[PDB]
Symmetry: D2
Subunit: 392 residues, 4 copies
């Protein structure tokens, strides 16, 4: 049916926990990235049919955080919006949902992506409404419960990363060397201007003064292998995962204008890339056949491609252990992966992260003249999200 | 373009605030409804491609409440699931999203609907993470902030209902007669068994016994116009809107199995109705040229129908003043509206309500042999959500 | 050295946890008791020199709860007031402090006693001011932390009672027979009007009506040994202490007017009893040479009395195991102990309880014409508090 | 009756809000000052008969904060202890209570004073136990509610200071010049070693490292009149009270060993001063006669003295407005007042403050060879606390 393209792809800088964006609600980050994505695509806000934004920690953000972002961006109040939560998947799954609505014939132009401000997550009192009656109870970290805690196994995401490291023998040393390379690559990318096209500044009107945040602050410049080897395991006595080889808690928004090829032509848009296939795409049989990261595998097959044919790959770094497991199984050429650094250095703003790596992927393909790109994040049946792009 | 149908449609009873469902998390109500929906459709859990569920008060409910409901229902862990939040529109928007995904060629069978437990919403401390420093602060009722408060105008949704009552000149008396009619129709429908097919019982297993909840708790049997006339305004001094002419705060899950017509035939399923059109369908020029209830007008127009041709209508009753404004503008025959009672009597479990009225519409169409049906809820630019159904 | 007397002695009923006094702040119970105590003593508010009141759960009750009670009772704003917290000892220690101030020549008329509303204790967030940073934390039940938890051993006061039961070899059976006897005596005392003189009614004025609370709510009329024998241990697996052989969590105020004998004569007051001695009286060599209940032994010795000479004894029943250990060690004649029932039946409103048993002792001495009385409560080094009274 | 003396007088440094002592609970500060007061008096911990300590913000501190301090100090577990709360009065009123118990013949040696850690005060949820039911509620700053908020007038203490400034015409300029002089005098006192005798270091065992806090940190060295004139009013639009001319929120403990003259002789103690009279002393008539600070006035008269005869005076600086009002009315010679600086510079750790200024007074009398001293704090009938000392 319709071909689907990315007309623009914009993100804020990624802030560190409790730092540069602590005072900027997720919805304002979202609004900042939407306003700019719309200008960068060269379309009018009224050309937009629907807004679809991921956001995981919605607690106390008020009704329909995606709608607030749309309205704050200056989009027409009558554009419908919805907020999606698939945890790790949210921000990228909104892009494939956009492509699906366009394919169904119901839209031509959709704002997609995601936003998160983990620094601002609340604490919760779950039994304040009808009473605790008696006894100490839990004052709930909402960021941990709704974003980072495995609802079924009743342990932290970090434990899952340990399990994978264990089962595959991904050693502490191997994870730290991977973390070091992500740090070095982010530092070079930032210092060489590789993110200048994709970052929209955020303006914080301070008590008096305006502050501009326009640079990713999470990378630890000058990281060394020695510095990483000294860190204590963060999740498990004598484990392999540390602060050093895992991503952080971060704040960002990242937004893309998704359009039918035919509408892009009509509006004089010069698109950046075509969406070729995605993890959600087509149906079955059979699911289990490909192995444990079958989402990404099957998405690659549906595009008619192989891993060797890919020019650039964004494979999210929630934990180095998980990144190394995926790269090993799919036999990625590591020179083509996370070329501007990955989440260990840059940050993992949950609900925005899938969209963030797609924004970094599309600009890197443009910059480096790379024809075939893969963005992939999250691990395990039901959860993997992946998109394949072919540059225009 | 694939034809899309409803293979089953099931809901829990709707509980009242702090009452029959207070001890049953939204995800468990959702799991109960999904497990039954699959059984009623006569399909296996393995036949489901994806789970898409409305839920507005997600705070503290843990990662991806839709995925939790899916898992707790017995559905394969590999089925992808996402949680959607469009406030009032959430539960019906998941049904049209299901149809779009099916139309795009990406799934054949999708569990859609919504779940909410307003009785269990937390309170929040928004500045607990980095500190309050000094001075009293707000202990935030999350149900009001995330479900009921207009994020822009900074007032209760009740105030919007009051403005609509003034706008359309709808009197206190008119609102209470409408409320009384919803109450009477709900009482007669309950007592005549009109909900017996669609309600799945919820079994609450305590430390000492079992309680079965299978009847809608919210209606006030024996309501009278004098009883309604004595009520104090809920939202403002000298207001027209009271607790007796507005819906409540309520707990429910409502799930439908949505399939392509082709898969339904292949699986031996006898579908209940075909989804003919929805407010999201086709693109937006010139959408605001119809009036303020243009999502609903545009959906009816896209079906190729008119209001006079409709046999049954479910038009949600968040507030009698809103229900009457939509009914006057669209010139509904009120004999065909909310024939088994509406949300004033039955309750408004936010992220489930749009699916709950679809579940009620489709069962009522079957029972009454009505060919053409409309479900509509929410009011205002870009919020209205509507679906048109044609009985099989 | 001035002689010191009790001119009046009044208490509210004792409410049960979350029940009859849940809506009445401790300071209001205190104000009700003070206003009546002054009236019963036949003195004017102007005749009071100082207000000294026990209150253990002061959190959030506002500045100087004793001063608030004093003011709300009609006492001149210039009367100095202080709030004392010695946990279990608070309410009786204020009576001996009153006597010391009178003996020192610094006052002639002091309002003493205690007030507590355990039903209204808050929960706490201890790190809200400077932040929790990350991770779940304790939402602290302040009643347990400030009123019931051993700050050193880091366990419930219930565990101390269990250790005392083991120490003194006091069986489950023995504790329940003692509890049943407290229940029976309380039921007979209530029904025979033994508390009618000492209880001041509390009038709760709602938005729509008035409720009068004037009867002790906590006793379980018709208790049986079989009913007690079926109870599960409260504090530890296979424990002897249950909810049926330990006191409750309760709400009360109890106030006495304490005067020099000289002022009482000057004001025309007929005093109820003379305070002969108290556990604080004279200095400490060699205080621990008596046993573990040496405050009580030493008070009796300072009166120039013995246990056999006492006519009535109020020995508080926080736990049956503690009550029985004190009674065995001191060889009390149990026919003279807690003759109108004790705290198992009647409740243990912490910072009021010591004054409440003094109020009950002095009324019982009057009614029964008993010359010599002992009130004792609390156990362990430096906590025990006791007063000896001689009827006028 | 018995003469009463101060055998030793010790305090911690006073920390600023959220600063040097933020990690040291009030009870540990108390314990540190008790252990040292006992050594400085040259008596054994077993010579102590009772512990009486002021502490206003007791919320969540656990049972009987004075007892915890005693136990943590290494005092015998059987010494009875009680915590007093008279807000501003607490710490000094414990010293006069000590003298009263000694006068009554019931003790020879008492530990008195007070402790507070305002940085550590909790936030409160007052309706967590039985439920908020619905609607936003207040997340309570316990420090403000229990320490700084006028329970009767329902406004901040700062408003009272404004009222006094208003009624007496104590101008902004006059208050800032008073604040400047307190700042200069504290700076000279600290730099000249005047507090070295009375400060006991506090040792904070850090993550690794021990930190020593031994210097008052609140003074703003180098303050200037210009700096103070630039500040905005803190309580009232166009008011006179600012951060600059008011004290802070501070953390400290200050403890004194109080003994009978006869026991000091017997134990070979060389006392520092005799307590001559106190605000609580003797009884009436008539109270209103002296004017609004009659507490202090009457205490001065009872010693047989006049204001002119005083050699040194500590008059607390909660707010410069209140200090200037008292000094004007009693016609203090300002050269003899707060000679080492006052609370504006040094801090006002509520429950400790009365004891802190008595500790500073007694050491200053020793240092400067001053025979007659007055300590006074708090304002308004019922609340004024005052003690007169005559040096040994």
């Amino acid at each position: 049916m319709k071909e689907v393209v990315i007309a623009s792809a914009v993100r804020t800088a990624i802030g560190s926990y409790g730092k540069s964006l602590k005072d900027v609600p997720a919805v304002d980050l979202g609004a900042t990235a939407i306003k700019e994505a719309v200008k960068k695509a060269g379309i009018k806000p009224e050309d937009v049919n629907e807004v679809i934004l991921g956001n995981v920690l919605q607690a106390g953000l008020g009704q329909n955080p995606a709608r607030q972002a749309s309205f704050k961006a200056g989009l027409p109040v009558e554009i419908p919006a919805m907020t999606i939560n698939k945890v790790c998947g949210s921000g990228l799954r909104t892009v494939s949902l956009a492509a699906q609505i366009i394919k169904a014939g119901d839209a031509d132009v959709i704002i997609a992506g995601g936003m998160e401000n983990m620094s601002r997550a609340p604490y919760l009192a779950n039994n304040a409404r009808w009473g605790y009656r008696m006894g100490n109870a839990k004052f709930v970290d909402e960021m941990i419960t709704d974003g980072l805690w495995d609802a079924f196994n009743d342990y932290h995401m970090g434990i899952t990363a340990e399990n994978i490291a264990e089962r595959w023998n991904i050693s502490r040393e191997e994870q730290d060397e991977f973390a070091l390379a992500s740090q070095k690559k982010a530092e070079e990318a930032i210092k060489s201007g590789q993110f200048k096209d994709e970052i929209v500044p955020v303006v914080i009107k301070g008590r008096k003064g305006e502050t501009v945040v326009d640079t990713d602050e999470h990378p630890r410049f000058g990281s060394t292998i020695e510095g990483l080897a000294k860190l204590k395991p963060a999740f498990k006595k004598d484990g392999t995962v540390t602060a050093g080889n895992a991503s952080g808690l971060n704040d960002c928004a990242a937004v893309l204008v998704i359009m039918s090829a035919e509408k892009a032509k009509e509006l004089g848009v010069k698109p950046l890339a075509k969406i070729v296939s995605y993890g959600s795409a087509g149906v079955d049989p059979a699911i289990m056949g490909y192995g444990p990261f079958y989402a990404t595998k099957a998405a690659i097959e549906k595009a008619g491609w192989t891993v060797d044919e890919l020019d650039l790959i964004e494979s999210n770094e929630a934990f180095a252990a998980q990144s190394l497991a995926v790269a090993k199984d799919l036999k990625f050429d590591m020179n083509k992966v996370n070329v501007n650094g990955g989440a260990i250095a840059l940050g993992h703003p949950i609900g925005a992260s899938g969209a963030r790596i797609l924004v970094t992927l599309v600009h890197a393909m443009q910059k480096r003249d790379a024809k075939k790109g893969l963005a992939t994040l999250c691990i395990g049946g039901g959860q993997g999200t992946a998109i394949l792009l072919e540059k225009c």
